[PDB]
Design a protein around this ligand. Structure first.
Ligand code: CL
Length: 341
């Protein structure tokens, strides 16, 4: 009996990806899900996870390599590795030099999800939906307060977004930038923010309960697709704003103690087949990292520039740098202060 243990994000695979793999290979898959890097990180820190494959962000993977959590990938067992986009490989290699440990899976941005009709009702037909001004300018957010504003409960993404918007380094290593200007702006916005939460905004966008959110692109597009399938009249869109936004990459990696390594490599090379990961993107509305797969992605996903952004949009994106623990600690205390008001 061949077995394979996978730990992935929620809502991050097609319904039949596992079933098809089982039919093709005869391998029994045990598939478990998490919905935060914090849950994932806690299990990787405790070790003896029992997983053969896990899906960290490339950022988190960088933090764990020095701990020896992962083992290097034998690329000779991944003959379709050549299908991966070399530019995505280079971006992930900022966290994983020479792409030793991780296989790029999916990637997206942190932008603005919004209710088209409710935003235009409050701010007019020319509402600045192409700009972080839509939610980071206090006069705008005061007007959208009534239809509901959510921010991620994610200081790393929110502070980097605020710093970029203010003209600071999105990855500032200077503590005063977090405690001074970034906190000042967030404190001014905070009375207009209904909640800080990194998943309630998906259903709330889809049902019309909130009209603007900071959110992950594909999760906002899932909300939009849910509203369309429900025929409830709700029109959700997503903006990568003109000032730029954070891009991030989720990757497959193999825990150092993984028992089912041959099965794990079969699954990784299965994901490298163009139709497999194209079908996942079709269902979860995230861009995958496989350049061979792109033409196979449905046109409604492939041609969506908030999922597959073109060159002028990608040039404005920034990626997260790992900070000294001193900055981590400053961010955490400042975030506490912001949420409490
Ligand atoms: Cl990342």
């Amino acid at each position: 009996q061949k077995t394979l243990h996978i730990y992935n994000w929620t809502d991050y695979i097609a319904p039949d990806t596992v079933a098809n793999f089982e039919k093709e290979t005869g391998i029994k898959v045990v598939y478990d899900v998490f919905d935060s890097n914090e849950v994932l990180e806690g299990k990787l820190m405790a070790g003896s996870t029992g997983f053969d494959l896990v899906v960290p962000s490339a950022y988190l993977l960088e933090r764990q390599l020095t701990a020896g959590v992962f083992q290097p990938l034998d690329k000779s067992k991944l003959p379709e590795w050549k299908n991966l986009d070399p530019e995505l490989l280079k971006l992930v290699a900022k966290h994983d030099p020479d792409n030793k440990f991780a296989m790029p899976y999916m990637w997206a941005t942190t932008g603005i999800g919004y209710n088209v009709d409710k935003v235009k009702a409050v701010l007019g037909e020319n509402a600045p939906v192409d700009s972080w001004d839509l939610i980071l300018k206090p006069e705008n957010l005061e007007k959208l307060k009534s239809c509901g504003v959510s921010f991620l409960d994610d200081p790393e993404e929110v502070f980097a977004t605020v710093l970029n918007y203010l003209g600071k380094d999105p990855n500032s290593t200077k503590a005063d930038d977090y405690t001074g200007p970034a906190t000042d702006l967030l404190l001014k916005l905070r009375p207009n923010i209904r909640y800080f939460h990194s998943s309630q905004y998906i259903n709330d966008l889809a049902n019309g309960d909130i009209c603007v959110a900071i959110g992950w692109a594909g999760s906002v597009w899932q909300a939009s697709n849910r509203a369309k399938e429900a025929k409830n009249g709700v029109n959700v869109s997503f903006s990568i704003p003109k000032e730029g936004a954070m891009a991030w990459f989720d990757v497959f990696a193999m825990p150092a103690d993984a028992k089912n390594k041959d099965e794990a490599y079969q699954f990784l090379n299965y994901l490298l087949r163009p139709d497999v990961v194209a079908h996942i993107s079709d269902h979860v509305f995230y861009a995958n990292a496989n350049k061979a797969a792109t033409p196979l992605v449905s046109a409604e996903v492939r041609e969506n520039p908030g999922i597959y952004p073109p060159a002028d949009v990608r040039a404005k994106l920034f990626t997260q740098k790992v900070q000294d623990p001193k900055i981590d600690r400053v961010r955490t205390r400042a975030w506490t202060k912001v949420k409490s008001g």
